[PDB]
Design a protein around this ligand. Structure first.
Ligand SMILES: [Mg+2]
Ligand SMILES: [Mg+2]
Ligand SMILES: [Mg+2]
Ligand SMILES: [Mg+2]
Ligand SMILES: [Mg+2]
Ligand SMILES: [Mg+2]
Ligand SMILES: [Mg+2]
Ligand SMILES: [Mg+2]
Ligand SMILES: [Mg+2]
Ligand SMILES: [Mg+2]
Ligand SMILES: [Mg+2]
Ligand SMILES: [Mg+2]
Ligand SMILES: [Mg+2]
Ligand SMILES: [Mg+2]
Ligand SMILES: [Mg+2]
Ligand SMILES: [Mg+2]
Ligand SMILES: [Mg+2]
Ligand SMILES: [Mg+2]
Ligand SMILES: [Mg+2]
Ligand SMILES: [Mg+2]
Ligand SMILES: [Mg+2]
Ligand SMILES: [Mg+2]
Ligand SMILES: [Mg+2]
Ligand SMILES: [Mg+2]
Ligand SMILES: [Mg+2]
Ligand SMILES: [Mg+2]
Ligand SMILES: [Mg+2]
Ligand SMILES: [Mg+2]
Ligand SMILES: [Mg+2]
Ligand SMILES: [Mg+2]
Ligand SMILES: [Mg+2]
Ligand SMILES: [Mg+2]
Ligand SMILES: [Mg+2]
Ligand SMILES: [Mg+2]
Ligand SMILES: [Mg+2]
Ligand SMILES: [Mg+2]
Ligand SMILES: [Mg+2]
Ligand SMILES: [Mg+2]
Ligand SMILES: [Mg+2]
Ligand SMILES: [Mg+2]
Ligand SMILES: [Mg+2]
Ligand SMILES: [Mg+2]
Ligand SMILES: [Mg+2]
Ligand SMILES: [Mg+2]
Ligand SMILES: [Mg+2]
Ligand SMILES: [Mg+2]
Ligand SMILES: [Mg+2]
Ligand SMILES: [Mg+2]
Ligand SMILES: [Mg+2]
Ligand SMILES: [Mg+2]
Ligand SMILES: [Mg+2]
Ligand SMILES: [Mg+2]
Ligand SMILES: [Mg+2]
Ligand SMILES: [Mg+2]
Ligand SMILES: [Mg+2]
Ligand SMILES: [Mg+2]
Ligand SMILES: [Mg+2]
Ligand SMILES: [Mg+2]
Ligand SMILES: [Mg+2]
Ligand SMILES: [Mg+2]
Ligand SMILES: [Mg+2]
Ligand SMILES: [Mg+2]
Ligand SMILES: [Mg+2]
Ligand SMILES: [Mg+2]
Ligand SMILES: [Mg+2]
Ligand SMILES: [Mg+2]
Ligand SMILES: [Mg+2]
Ligand SMILES: [Mg+2]
Ligand SMILES: [Mg+2]
Ligand SMILES: [Mg+2]
Ligand SMILES: [Mg+2]
Ligand SMILES: [Mg+2]
Ligand SMILES: [Mg+2]
Ligand SMILES: [Mg+2]
Ligand SMILES: [Mg+2]
Ligand SMILES: [Mg+2]
Ligand SMILES: [Mg+2]
Ligand SMILES: [Mg+2]
Ligand SMILES: [Mg+2]
Ligand SMILES: [Mg+2]
Ligand SMILES: [Mg+2]
Ligand SMILES: [Mg+2]
Ligand SMILES: [Mg+2]
Ligand SMILES: [Mg+2]
Ligand SMILES: [Mg+2]
Ligand SMILES: [Mg+2]
Ligand SMILES: [Mg+2]
Ligand SMILES: [Mg+2]
Ligand SMILES: [Mg+2]
Ligand SMILES: [Mg+2]
Ligand SMILES: [Mg+2]
Ligand SMILES: [Mg+2]
Ligand SMILES: [Mg+2]
Ligand SMILES: [Mg+2]
Ligand SMILES: [Mg+2]
Ligand SMILES: [Mg+2]
Ligand SMILES: [Mg+2]
Ligand SMILES: [Mg+2]
Ligand SMILES: [Mg+2]
Ligand SMILES: [Mg+2]
Ligand SMILES: [Mg+2]
Ligand SMILES: [Mg+2]
Ligand SMILES: [Mg+2]
Ligand SMILES: [Mg+2]
Ligand SMILES: [Mg+2]
Ligand SMILES: [Mg+2]
Ligand SMILES: [Mg+2]
Ligand SMILES: [Mg+2]
Ligand SMILES: [Mg+2]
Ligand SMILES: [Mg+2]
Ligand SMILES: [Mg+2]
Ligand SMILES: [Mg+2]
Ligand SMILES: [Mg+2]
Ligand SMILES: [Mg+2]
Ligand SMILES: [Mg+2]
Ligand SMILES: [Mg+2]
Ligand SMILES: [Mg+2]
Ligand SMILES: [Mg+2]
Ligand SMILES: [Mg+2]
Ligand SMILES: [Mg+2]
Ligand SMILES: [Mg+2]
Ligand SMILES: [Mg+2]
Ligand SMILES: [Mg+2]
Ligand SMILES: [Mg+2]
Ligand SMILES: [Mg+2]
Ligand SMILES: [Mg+2]
Ligand SMILES: [Mg+2]
Ligand SMILES: [Mg+2]
Ligand SMILES: [Mg+2]
Ligand SMILES: [Mg+2]
Ligand SMILES: [Mg+2]
Ligand SMILES: [Mg+2]
Ligand SMILES: [Mg+2]
Ligand SMILES: [Mg+2]
Ligand SMILES: [Mg+2]
Ligand SMILES: [Mg+2]
Ligand SMILES: [Mg+2]
Ligand SMILES: [Mg+2]
Ligand SMILES: [Mg+2]
Ligand SMILES: [Mg+2]
Ligand SMILES: [Mg+2]
Ligand SMILES: [Mg+2]
Ligand SMILES: [Mg+2]
Ligand SMILES: [Mg+2]
Ligand SMILES: [Mg+2]
Ligand SMILES: [Mg+2]
Ligand SMILES: [Mg+2]
Ligand SMILES: [Mg+2]
Ligand SMILES: [Mg+2]
Ligand SMILES: [Mg+2]
Ligand SMILES: [Mg+2]
Ligand SMILES: [Mg+2]
Ligand SMILES: [Mg+2]
Ligand SMILES: [Mg+2]
Ligand SMILES: [Mg+2]
Ligand SMILES: [Mg+2]
Ligand SMILES: [Mg+2]
Ligand SMILES: [Mg+2]
Ligand SMILES: [Mg+2]
Ligand SMILES: [Mg+2]
Ligand SMILES: [Mg+2]
Ligand SMILES: [Mg+2]
Ligand SMILES: [Mg+2]
Ligand SMILES: [Mg+2]
Ligand SMILES: [Mg+2]
Ligand SMILES: [Mg+2]
Ligand SMILES: [Mg+2]
Ligand SMILES: [Mg+2]
Ligand SMILES: [Mg+2]
Ligand SMILES: [Mg+2]
Ligand SMILES: [Mg+2]
Ligand SMILES: [Mg+2]
Ligand SMILES: [Mg+2]
Ligand SMILES: [Mg+2]
Ligand SMILES: [Mg+2]
Ligand SMILES: [Mg+2]
Ligand SMILES: [Mg+2]
Ligand SMILES: [Mg+2]
Ligand SMILES: [Mg+2]
Ligand SMILES: [Mg+2]
Ligand SMILES: [Mg+2]
Ligand SMILES: [Mg+2]
Ligand SMILES: [Mg+2]
Ligand SMILES: [Mg+2]
Ligand SMILES: [Mg+2]
Ligand SMILES: [Mg+2]
Ligand SMILES: [Mg+2]
Ligand SMILES: [Mg+2]
Ligand SMILES: [Mg+2]
Ligand SMILES: [Mg+2]
Ligand SMILES: [Mg+2]
Ligand SMILES: [Mg+2]
Ligand SMILES: [Mg+2]
Ligand SMILES: [Mg+2]
Ligand SMILES: [Mg+2]
Ligand SMILES: [Mg+2]
Ligand SMILES: [Mg+2]
Ligand SMILES: [Mg+2]
Ligand SMILES: [Mg+2]
Ligand SMILES: [Mg+2]
Ligand SMILES: [Mg+2]
Ligand SMILES: [Mg+2]
Ligand SMILES: [Mg+2]
Ligand SMILES: [Mg+2]
Ligand SMILES: [Mg+2]
Ligand SMILES: [Mg+2]
Ligand SMILES: [Mg+2]
Ligand SMILES: [Mg+2]
Ligand SMILES: [Mg+2]
Ligand SMILES: [Mg+2]
Ligand SMILES: [Mg+2]
Ligand SMILES: [Mg+2]
Ligand SMILES: [Mg+2]
Ligand SMILES: [Mg+2]
Ligand SMILES: [Mg+2]
Ligand SMILES: [Mg+2]
Ligand SMILES: [Mg+2]
Ligand SMILES: [Mg+2]
Ligand SMILES: [Mg+2]
Ligand SMILES: [Mg+2]
Ligand SMILES: [Mg+2]
Ligand SMILES: [Mg+2]
Ligand SMILES: [Mg+2]
Ligand SMILES: [Mg+2]
Ligand SMILES: [Mg+2]
Ligand SMILES: [Mg+2]
Ligand SMILES: [Mg+2]
Ligand SMILES: [Mg+2]
Ligand SMILES: [Mg+2]
Ligand SMILES: [Mg+2]
Ligand SMILES: [Mg+2]
Ligand SMILES: [Mg+2]
Ligand SMILES: [Mg+2]
Ligand SMILES: [Mg+2]
Ligand SMILES: [Mg+2]
Ligand SMILES: [Mg+2]
Ligand SMILES: [Mg+2]
Ligand SMILES: [Mg+2]
Ligand SMILES: [Mg+2]
Ligand SMILES: [Mg+2]
Ligand SMILES: [Mg+2]
Ligand SMILES: [Mg+2]
Ligand SMILES: [Mg+2]
Ligand SMILES: [Mg+2]
Ligand SMILES: [Mg+2]
Ligand SMILES: [Mg+2]
Ligand SMILES: [Mg+2]
Ligand SMILES: [Mg+2]
Ligand SMILES: [Mg+2]
Ligand SMILES: [Mg+2]
Ligand SMILES: [Mg+2]
Ligand SMILES: [Mg+2]
Ligand SMILES: [Mg+2]
Ligand SMILES: [Mg+2]
Ligand SMILES: [Mg+2]
Ligand SMILES: [Mg+2]
Ligand SMILES: [Mg+2]
Ligand SMILES: [Mg+2]
Ligand SMILES: [Mg+2]
Ligand SMILES: [Mg+2]
Ligand SMILES: [Mg+2]
Ligand SMILES: [Mg+2]
Ligand SMILES: [Zn+2]
Lengths: 118, 122, 131, 13, 59, 204
RNA sequence: CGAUGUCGGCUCGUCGCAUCCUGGGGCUGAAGAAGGUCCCAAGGGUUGGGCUGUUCGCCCAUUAAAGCGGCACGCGAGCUGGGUUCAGAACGUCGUGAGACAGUUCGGUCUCUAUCCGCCACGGGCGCAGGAGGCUUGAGGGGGGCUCUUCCUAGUACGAGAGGACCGGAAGGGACGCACCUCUGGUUUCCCAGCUGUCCCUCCAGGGGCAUAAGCUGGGUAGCCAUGUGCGGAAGGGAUAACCGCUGAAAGCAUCUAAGCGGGAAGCCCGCCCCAAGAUGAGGCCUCCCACGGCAGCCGGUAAGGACCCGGGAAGACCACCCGGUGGAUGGGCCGGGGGUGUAAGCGCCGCGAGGCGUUGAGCCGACCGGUCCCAAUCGUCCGAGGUCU
RNA sequence: GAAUGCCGGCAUGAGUAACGAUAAAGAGGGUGAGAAUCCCUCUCGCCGUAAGCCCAAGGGUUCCUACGCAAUGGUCGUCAG
RNA sequence: CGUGAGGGAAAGGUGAAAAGAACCCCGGGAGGGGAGUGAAAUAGAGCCUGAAACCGUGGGCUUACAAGCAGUCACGGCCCC
């Protein structure tokens, strides 16, 4: 069973799943908007929102924390200096998911876009 | 939580050092003995010229268990070993001393002689 | 409806507020109300607390003592009415929350591993000086 | 009770 | 195991009876309030790029 | 016979006479009687009870009608208690005093598709000594040519839980009328937040 | 014989009753207790070990008891493969020999995919002549059904004594069953910390990958759990078995019986729990819509309602069920609390240094209990009565 | 009309088992009628006494480039032995 | 196919005449729809005739309380002549 269990598995072992989220985070923070499968998208929100919320803190601790997942100093500089500030007065919800209308041809996978909020 | 094949320390001066439970005397088919229950055991280890010798089939009551026992007041108690005291068919200790603490549950089960002889009752 | 609050409400009548705080590593003397027939008396249990498992009204702590050559562990409910009082006899410095590891250690080894928590000892003597 | 088998143990094709 | 096998050829009636549940359900579609084109609901319209009133996507 | 509807809120223990007593807390009251079944009209005797109040925006017109005929605000759950006919127009926890024994009915937790070991406590198979892919299997399920079939009711894997279960003769440890609370001793079927039914016990 | 796989074990049962126990009896060379023997009774129960491949049997420790049979000596498209039917080898024995032996010894390929019936679960369809939303009756099924010890009566009745009751009452158990997670005890694949080696970011510090599909180690919430907790076997009503009677002829007596009436089992019927109106014999109650336009039929749009779609769920393989969809707390964020880990980074001080101290119960922080419209359940679509006849 | 006959064609099982090592993927940008599968970039993972490199057997144009996707490729294909 | 000696297939038919379908339309192509040729194009090259198993579309009758080697005998209903 699965009673009151939180978190998708996405058919990956523990370290692959982590990487998946970390890589999607790098891509989202880099381009502001990416397209994925709906399940990957819905799961990315929390992972990235937390990273953004820490950038909103600003301190050295937060920077080194975010650096654990994002791993890229320049990308984190962008996070703290350009991304984080526009969410100063926003209380969570820094990302949105909207579903596309067309499925992948090769496997019928339903797609969705994930973007940072205005 | 004692069953057949379980080795028990013997906490008296009967001469026995280690007994191995071969049956728990509690109904048709009890699976485990706890404190205050009587088992039948084999003397697997003894010291020279005691009352009991290796090979003897003896009765004993369990006075200590590594599996914690629970109490109606919501508390529990647990010991470092599983220990027994060798008795006769009258539930009386065959020895004259018992060593180490014993479970208070022995009292409510009519093993007053052992409880009295015990250095501490917890 | 707040199911969590309801439970807390039920529990509240039974909650204690008179016991001193203690940590795993501390040496503690729990005075416990024990019944032996037909009178009841207070029995003292004193040892190192090796575990505290928190759950509000339902937290329990485990105390470990070596008694007449046999190790004894006792689990107490932190809010049990059968506890008269608890006396901090010594503050111990642990580096983990559960101290099961001391079960396999000599008296010497335990002593080296659980140095006296000088900071909280000073805190104890720093208070107790009252108006 | 033990009685003689009436079939051999099956050999591969 | 000992290699289970069909004992009898399935009749045309029985094979087709099995497939009485095989028909496709047509796609559920709704008009897009902006360009009136037909598209699945709760998806960003792939014709004009509008969803929830606003332009979201370049078509 | 008497009864009330209620939601299971959670478990704890309280202390009473230097004893720890495990309890399940139940939010029972208040339940308005919304319909009465009569031997003249319905052929039997019971009271339809309502529980939990409902956003009228969600109550359809046939349901609206039913409540209105009873002069009762919209309620989430409608359920009957058999051979029970309270004088009042409202059933509350006060119909139980501490010390009474009760029967609690709920919807048990669902194990979904359950194996024969979980469901029926089968022993399954050995885990070594040659056991071949049958560790949690049920073994034989029949005989041979006689009878050449399997009994109806043969214990097999399948769904388990999410089913009506009534545990009987539970001690009422306490009742807290100002909070519509019942404290029953022991365990009650189903998850926290599940709807339960508390009836006076049928055991003697 | 164009194959019906063969001992024993394991798993899973189910039936019989010539009954092992438990319940009810009659007789006894039945004082009491305990036996013997026969009758009634198949509801439940009928333990764990040593030896042997064993079935069987002997033995140990118990037990209320450690029942005997059928089901292809039940069950290898369920498992095992010790026994026993292949090919190797050896012993004893027989044969000049090749070889052989209800004589022995060591070894020796057990086949992923279930079409039909049957079984366990779950849906789709149509039906139940208006169409709908709820709440129910229970025909008929299924589940359950065990038992011991101690104390009181009472050291009384009975007995020289030893010993020791009936009836009635009270407590404590074993095994099993259902549910449950407050406690006890597990797990908890990334919730926290510690640690080695290497490569890397960015030199220090601080971090990241890999060492498993957690590198290792110490802990560990929710959930799912038993070793943990609650509760169940009944009570009770009725009809009976063997058996015991009341009244009573045939047959002036006698007779439980021929008229008639009692008493009497763990068994039977009901009672308890669960399923259940496809119960086509398709039941009942409450409430809602309603008399539509065109030629017991057809077409067209609606009503009450329903479905689609979406956010989800201790519900779940899909399906179903259940909650919610902005008139919203459904999930995700965010905040508070719980909880886990056990005092982060940075800086300051102390030491040559490994480190130590303070800041500091700090920092991190899945699921649990709540709050908050910050993000997403936008916008919508399609079905859906007009009520047959005595 | 049958020979577990012969040759061929087409069914059933069935939209079922399976799609050949659990070293692993994610995004962005090109191309194109068409892209999870081709090209480029960044991130991630695997091998490293190899899963890298050089010979000899054997194979025999499979080499390089342009233009192609009916079939071969266990899917796809604009890519390819 | 086999190291080899050796084994050893399958596979014929447009029309009298290519007159083998210019050109247009949908399509990436394949394929098709018109146009055109022909006595004939379901003779269009996957080409004479084109049986059967097998698959499908349309229509008539029939079927969701019924027990079977599937037929046969009777009667009735509906549809057709
Ligand atoms: Mg699982
Ligand atoms: Mg959840
Ligand atoms: Mg999940
Ligand atoms: Mg995760
Ligand atoms: Mg994926
Ligand atoms: Mg998988
Ligand atoms: Mg790893
Ligand atoms: Mg761009
Ligand atoms: Mg989509
Ligand atoms: Mg699509
Ligand atoms: Mg594809
Ligand atoms: Mg879609
Ligand atoms: Mg000792
Ligand atoms: Mg010896
Ligand atoms: Mg002996
Ligand atoms: Mg809530
Ligand atoms: Mg709680
Ligand atoms: Mg409150
Ligand atoms: Mg508290
Ligand atoms: Mg509290
Ligand atoms: Mg020393
Ligand atoms: Mg200090
Ligand atoms: Mg034999
Ligand atoms: Mg196999
Ligand atoms: Mg078939
Ligand atoms: Mg057939
Ligand atoms: Mg056929
Ligand atoms: Mg078939
Ligand atoms: Mg057909
Ligand atoms: Mg819109
Ligand atoms: Mg009735
Ligand atoms: Mg009544
Ligand atoms: Mg499982
Ligand atoms: Mg299980
Ligand atoms: Mg079960
Ligand atoms: Mg087993
Ligand atoms: Mg077993
Ligand atoms: Mg097992
Ligand atoms: Mg094998
Ligand atoms: Mg095998
Ligand atoms: Mg295995
Ligand atoms: Mg099996
Ligand atoms: Mg078989
Ligand atoms: Mg049969
Ligand atoms: Mg279900
Ligand atoms: Mg009771
Ligand atoms: Mg209910
Ligand atoms: Mg044969
Ligand atoms: Mg045959
Ligand atoms: Mg066969
Ligand atoms: Mg046979
Ligand atoms: Mg056969
Ligand atoms: Mg088995
Ligand atoms: Mg076995
Ligand atoms: Mg076994
Ligand atoms: Mg049977
Ligand atoms: Mg049997
Ligand atoms: Mg008999
Ligand atoms: Mg006999
Ligand atoms: Mg016997
Ligand atoms: Mg008897
Ligand atoms: Mg008897
Ligand atoms: Mg008798
Ligand atoms: Mg006698
Ligand atoms: Mg008598
Ligand atoms: Mg006598
Ligand atoms: Mg006789
Ligand atoms: Mg007798
Ligand atoms: Mg006899
Ligand atoms: Mg006899
Ligand atoms: Mg029986
Ligand atoms: Mg039977
Ligand atoms: Mg039987
Ligand atoms: Mg045995
Ligand atoms: Mg044995
Ligand atoms: Mg041995
Ligand atoms: Mg053996
Ligand atoms: Mg044997
Ligand atoms: Mg015999
Ligand atoms: Mg023998
Ligand atoms: Mg007896
Ligand atoms: Mg035996
Ligand atoms: Mg036997
Ligand atoms: Mg016998
Ligand atoms: Mg017999
Ligand atoms: Mg038997
Ligand atoms: Mg048999
Ligand atoms: Mg036989
Ligand atoms: Mg047999
Ligand atoms: Mg057999
Ligand atoms: Mg047998
Ligand atoms: Mg048998
Ligand atoms: Mg068989
Ligand atoms: Mg086999
Ligand atoms: Mg066998
Ligand atoms: Mg078979
Ligand atoms: Mg052998
Ligand atoms: Mg032979
Ligand atoms: Mg040999
Ligand atoms: Mg000779
Ligand atoms: Mg010779
Ligand atoms: Mg001779
Ligand atoms: Mg011969
Ligand atoms: Mg033989
Ligand atoms: Mg022979
Ligand atoms: Mg032999
Ligand atoms: Mg041998
Ligand atoms: Mg070998
Ligand atoms: Mg052999
Ligand atoms: Mg063998
Ligand atoms: Mg075979
Ligand atoms: Mg296999
Ligand atoms: Mg299959
Ligand atoms: Mg099938
Ligand atoms: Mg069949
Ligand atoms: Mg079937
Ligand atoms: Mg259905
Ligand atoms: Mg059905
Ligand atoms: Mg009718
Ligand atoms: Mg009608
Ligand atoms: Mg209804
Ligand atoms: Mg019935
Ligand atoms: Mg029926
Ligand atoms: Mg019944
Ligand atoms: Mg029954
Ligand atoms: Mg007495
Ligand atoms: Mg006397
Ligand atoms: Mg006396
Ligand atoms: Mg007395
Ligand atoms: Mg008397
Ligand atoms: Mg006398
Ligand atoms: Mg006496
Ligand atoms: Mg009695
Ligand atoms: Mg149940
Ligand atoms: Mg739980
Ligand atoms: Mg908990
Ligand atoms: Mg727990
Ligand atoms: Mg725990
Ligand atoms: Mg643990
Ligand atoms: Mg983490
Ligand atoms: Mg990590
Ligand atoms: Mg790690
Ligand atoms: Mg650590
Ligand atoms: Mg290191
Ligand atoms: Mg490292
Ligand atoms: Mg460093
Ligand atoms: Mg570092
Ligand atoms: Mg990283
Ligand atoms: Mg690396
Ligand atoms: Mg690693
Ligand atoms: Mg590596
Ligand atoms: Mg790896
Ligand atoms: Mg771990
Ligand atoms: Mg946990
Ligand atoms: Mg248990
Ligand atoms: Mg009666
Ligand atoms: Mg008489
Ligand atoms: Mg008379
Ligand atoms: Mg009569
Ligand atoms: Mg007569
Ligand atoms: Mg009678
Ligand atoms: Mg009488
Ligand atoms: Mg009973
Ligand atoms: Mg129903
Ligand atoms: Mg029901
Ligand atoms: Mg109905
Ligand atoms: Mg019903
Ligand atoms: Mg109905
Ligand atoms: Mg009725
Ligand atoms: Mg009108
Ligand atoms: Mg109208
Ligand atoms: Mg008209
Ligand atoms: Mg409407
Ligand atoms: Mg579930
Ligand atoms: Mg779902
Ligand atoms: Mg669905
Ligand atoms: Mg809804
Ligand atoms: Mg809407
Ligand atoms: Mg709206
Ligand atoms: Mg609002
Ligand atoms: Mg929410
Ligand atoms: Mg929320
Ligand atoms: Mg979610
Ligand atoms: Mg709380
Ligand atoms: Mg805390
Ligand atoms: Mg510090
Ligand atoms: Mg610090
Ligand atoms: Mg300094
Ligand atoms: Mg210095
Ligand atoms: Mg310095
Ligand atoms: Mg401070
Ligand atoms: Mg927090
Ligand atoms: Mg929450
Ligand atoms: Mg609000
Ligand atoms: Mg909003
Ligand atoms: Mg319509
Ligand atoms: Mg309509
Ligand atoms: Mg009309
Ligand atoms: Mg008329
Ligand atoms: Mg012929
Ligand atoms: Mg064949
Ligand atoms: Mg055949
Ligand atoms: Mg032939
Ligand atoms: Mg032929
Ligand atoms: Mg053929
Ligand atoms: Mg399928
Ligand atoms: Mg199949
Ligand atoms: Mg399958
Ligand atoms: Mg598959
Ligand atoms: Mg492959
Ligand atoms: Mg393959
Ligand atoms: Mg693969
Ligand atoms: Mg894979
Ligand atoms: Mg692209
Ligand atoms: Mg271009
Ligand atoms: Mg383009
Ligand atoms: Mg592609
Ligand atoms: Mg493509
Ligand atoms: Mg791409
Ligand atoms: Mg790939
Ligand atoms: Mg490696
Ligand atoms: Mg190397
Ligand atoms: Mg190496
Ligand atoms: Mg060459
Ligand atoms: Mg070649
Ligand atoms: Mg060139
Ligand atoms: Mg191709
Ligand atoms: Mg292609
Ligand atoms: Mg192609
Ligand atoms: Mg070509
Ligand atoms: Mg292909
Ligand atoms: Mg391939
Ligand atoms: Mg190319
Ligand atoms: Mg190339
Ligand atoms: Mg060749
Ligand atoms: Mg060749
Ligand atoms: Mg031809
Ligand atoms: Mg010609
Ligand atoms: Mg010609
Ligand atoms: Mg074109
Ligand atoms: Mg064109
Ligand atoms: Mg192309
Ligand atoms: Mg063309
Ligand atoms: Mg054409
Ligand atoms: Mg012409
Ligand atoms: Mg012409
Ligand atoms: Mg002509
Ligand atoms: Mg044409
Ligand atoms: Mg034609
Ligand atoms: Mg023609
Ligand atoms: Mg022609
Ligand atoms: Mg010709
Ligand atoms: Mg032709
Ligand atoms: Mg043709
Ligand atoms: Mg044809
Ligand atoms: Mg047709
Ligand atoms: Mg019928
Ligand atoms: Mg009909
Ligand atoms: Mg029929
Ligand atoms: Mg027939
Ligand atoms: Mg006929
Ligand atoms: Mg006739
Ligand atoms: Zn549009």
């Amino acid at each position: 069973m699965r009673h009151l269990k939180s978190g998708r598995k996405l058919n990956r072992h523990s370290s692959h799943r982590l990487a998946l989220y970390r890589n999607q985070a790098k891509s989202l923070l880099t381009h502001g908007r990416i397209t994925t499968t709906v399940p990957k998208a819905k799961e990315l929100r929390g992972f990235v929102d937390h990273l953004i919320h820490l950038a909103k803190r600003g301190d050295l601790h937060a920077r080194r924390l975010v650096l654990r997942d994002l791993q890229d100093v320049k990308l984190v500089r962008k996070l703290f200096d350009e991304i984080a500030p526009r969410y100063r007065d926003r209380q969570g919800g820094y990302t949105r998911v909207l579903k596309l209308a067309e499925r992948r041809r090769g496997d019928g996978a339903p797609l969705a876009l994930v973007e940072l909020v205005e | 939580m004692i069953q057949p094949q379980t080795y028990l320390e013997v906490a008296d001066n009967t001469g026995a050092r280690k007994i191995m439970c071969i049956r728990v005397l509690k109904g048709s088919n009890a699976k485990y003995a706890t404190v205050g229950d009587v088992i039948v055991a084999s003397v697997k280890e003894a010291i020279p010229r005691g009352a009991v010798k290796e090979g003897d089939v003896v009765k004993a009551v369990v006075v200590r268990t590594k599996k914690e026992i629970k109490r109606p007041d919501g508390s529990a108690i647990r010991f470092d070993d599983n220990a027994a005291v060798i008795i006769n068919n009258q539930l009386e200790p065959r020895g004259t001393r018992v060593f180490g603490p014993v479970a208070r549950e022995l009292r409510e089960k009519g093993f007053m002689k052992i409880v009295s002889l015990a250095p501490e009752v917890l | 409806m707040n199911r969590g609050a309801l439970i807390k409400l039920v529990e509240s009548r039974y909650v204690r507020t008179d016991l001193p705080e203690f940590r795993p590593g501390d040496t503690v003397r729990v005075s416990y109300k024990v019944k032996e027939g037909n009178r009841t008396r207070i029995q003292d249990f004193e040892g190192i607390v090796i575990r505290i498992r928190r759950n509000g009204f339902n937290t329990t702590f485990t105390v470990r003592k070596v008694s007449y050559g046999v190790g004894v562990e006792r689990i107490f409910p932190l809010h049990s009415p059968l506890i008269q009082k608890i006396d901090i006899v010594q503050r111990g410095r642990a580096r983990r929350a559960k101290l099961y590891f001391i079960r396999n250690l000599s008296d010497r080894e335990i002593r080296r591993k659980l140095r006296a928590d000088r900071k909280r000892i000073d805190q104890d003597r720093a208070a107790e000086r009252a108006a | 009770v033990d009685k003689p088998p009436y079939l051999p143990r099956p050999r591969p094709p | 195991a000992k290699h289970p096998v069909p004992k009898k050829k399935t009749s045309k009636a029985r094979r087709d009876a099995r497939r009485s549940h095989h028909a496709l359900t047509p796609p559920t579609l709704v008009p897009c309030p902006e360009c009136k084109a037909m598209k699945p609901p709760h998806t960003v319209c792939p014709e004009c790029g509008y969803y929830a009133g606003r332009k979201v996507l370049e078509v | 016979m008497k009864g009330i509807l209620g939601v299971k809120v959670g478990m704890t223990r309280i202390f009473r006479d230097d004893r720890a007593v495990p309890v399940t807390v139940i939010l029972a009251g208040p339940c308005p009687v919304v319909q009465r079944r009569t031997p003249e009209k319905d052929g039997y005797t019971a009271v339809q009870l309502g529980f939990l109040p409902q956003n009228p925006k969600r109550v359809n017109r046939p349901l609206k009608g039913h409540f209105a005929k009873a002069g009762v605000e919209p309620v989430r759950i409608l359920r009957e208690i058999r051979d029970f006919n309270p004088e009042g127009d409202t059933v509350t926890v006060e119909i139980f005093k501490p010390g009474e024994r009760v029967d609690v009915t709920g919807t048990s937790k669902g194990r979904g598709f359950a194996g024969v070991m979980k469901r029926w406590n089968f022993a399954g198979g050995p885990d070594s000594h040659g056991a071949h892919k049958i560790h949690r299997h049920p073994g034989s399920i029949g005989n041979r040519k006689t009878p050449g079939r399997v009994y109806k009711g043969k214990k097999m894997a399948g769904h388990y839980g999410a089913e009506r279960v009534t545990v009987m003769n539970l001690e009422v440890v306490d009742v807290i009328p100002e909070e519509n609370l019942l404290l029953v001793k022991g365990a009650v079927p189903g998850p926290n937040g599940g709807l339960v039914i508390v009836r006076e016990t049928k055991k003697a």
